[PDB]
């Protein structure tokens, strides 16, 4: 138990994640979820970078 999910995420979903390097949000796809830690491994689309970031950092892709 680490991050208590406030959002329900599934593998292969598009989300926006906060890049650990800039702290800004970027579009990323969930590759793997760890519900215990409340984290998901996401891959930033276009760049190809991937990081394990808590579901709390994952935001829905709101196009506006
Ligand atoms: C959200 N992510 C991963 C990024 N915004 N990445 C930018 C740095 C990596 C890029 N290939 C580059 O070297 O420019």
Short mmCIF file of C-alpha atoms and ligand atoms in Angstrom, two decimals:
data_model
loop_
_atom_site.label_atom_id
_atom_site.label_comp_id
_atom_site.label_asym_id
_atom_site.label_seq_id
_atom_site.Cartn_x
_atom_site.Cartn_y
_atom_site.Cartn_z
CA UNK A 1 0.00 0.00 0.00
CA UNK A 2 1.46 3.29 -1.12
CA UNK A 3 -0.71 5.43 -3.32
CA UNK A 4 -4.40 5.14 -2.65
CA UNK A 5 -6.08 5.33 -6.09
CA UNK A 6 -8.47 8.16 -6.66
CA UNK A 7 -8.85 7.20 -10.28
CA UNK A 8 -9.46 3.88 -11.96
CA UNK A 9 -6.81 3.15 -14.57
CA UNK A 10 -6.35 0.21 -16.93
CA UNK A 11 -3.41 -1.06 -19.01
CA UNK A 12 -3.19 0.53 -22.45
CA UNK A 13 -4.92 3.70 -21.51
CA UNK A 14 -3.90 7.12 -22.40
CA UNK A 15 -3.18 9.42 -19.64
CA UNK A 16 -1.11 12.38 -18.89
CA UNK A 17 1.69 11.90 -16.55
CA UNK A 18 3.89 14.26 -14.77
CA UNK A 19 7.39 13.97 -16.14
CA UNK A 20 9.68 13.37 -13.22
CA UNK A 21 12.32 15.54 -14.89
CA UNK A 22 10.32 18.74 -15.60
CA UNK A 23 7.36 18.20 -13.37
CA UNK A 24 5.12 19.08 -16.33
CA UNK A 25 2.35 16.88 -17.67
CA UNK A 26 2.83 14.91 -20.90
CA UNK A 27 0.77 12.33 -22.77
CA UNK A 28 1.63 8.79 -21.76
CA UNK A 29 0.22 5.32 -22.10
CA UNK A 30 -0.02 2.85 -19.24
CA UNK A 31 2.06 -0.22 -19.82
CA UNK A 32 1.71 -1.82 -16.44
CA UNK A 33 -0.20 -1.07 -13.25
CA UNK A 34 0.72 -1.95 -9.72
CA UNK A 35 -2.41 -1.52 -7.65
CA UNK A 36 -0.56 -2.32 -4.42
CA UNK A 37 1.68 0.70 -4.75
CA UNK A 38 -0.95 2.53 -6.69
CA UNK A 39 1.55 3.13 -9.41
CA UNK A 40 1.60 2.63 -13.08
CA UNK A 41 4.35 2.31 -15.56
CA UNK A 42 3.68 4.63 -18.34
CA UNK A 43 5.34 5.46 -21.59
CA UNK A 44 5.35 9.03 -22.81
CA UNK A 45 3.98 8.99 -26.32
CA UNK A 46 6.24 10.38 -28.96
CA UNK A 47 9.32 10.35 -26.83
CA UNK A 48 9.30 6.70 -25.91
CA UNK A 49 10.35 7.35 -22.32
CA UNK A 50 8.87 5.32 -19.61
CA UNK A 51 8.68 5.69 -15.90
CA UNK A 52 6.78 4.25 -12.99
CA UNK A 53 4.60 6.98 -11.67
CA UNK A 54 1.81 6.86 -9.05
CA UNK A 55 -1.81 6.91 -10.27
CA UNK A 56 -2.09 10.24 -8.41
CA UNK A 57 0.25 11.70 -11.04
CA UNK A 58 -1.78 10.30 -13.83
CA UNK A 59 -4.33 12.66 -15.17
CA UNK A 60 -6.98 11.92 -17.81
CA UNK A 61 -6.36 13.13 -21.35
CA UNK A 62 -8.54 16.15 -21.42
CA UNK A 63 -8.25 17.75 -24.81
CA UNK A 64 -8.76 21.23 -23.63
C1 LIG B 1 7.70 13.48 -21.29
N1 LIG B 1 9.02 13.22 -21.84
C2 LIG B 1 9.59 11.89 -21.73
C3 LIG B 1 9.69 14.18 -22.39
N2 LIG B 1 9.17 15.37 -22.46
N3 LIG B 1 10.89 13.92 -22.88
C4 LIG B 1 11.78 14.87 -23.53
C5 LIG B 1 13.21 14.38 -23.48
C6 LIG B 1 13.44 13.20 -24.39
C7 LIG B 1 13.47 13.57 -25.87
N4 LIG B 1 13.71 12.41 -26.69
C8 LIG B 1 14.59 14.53 -26.12
O1 LIG B 1 15.74 14.14 -25.91
O2 LIG B 1 14.35 15.66 -26.57
#
